[PDB]
Amino acid sequence: GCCSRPPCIANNPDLC
């Protein structure tokens, strides 16, 4: 998925 916000702020491909 794609998170512009936490907790996807870490080194996770979901951080788009």
Alpha-carbon distance of 12 to 6, in angstroms, equals 11
| Location of structure tokens 């998170």 | 3
DSSP state of 2: -
Structure tokens at 7: 């907790």
Question: Reduced to 3 DSSP states, what percent helix, strand and coil does the chain have, rounded to the nearest 5?
Answer: 0, 10, 90
Closest Cα partner for 3 from 12, 14, 11, 13?
A: 14
Amino acid identity for residue 8 in this structure? C
Q: What 8-state DSSP symbol labels residue 1? A: -
| Cβ-proximal residues to 3 (8 Å cutoff; 6+ apart), any chain | 9, 14, 15, 16
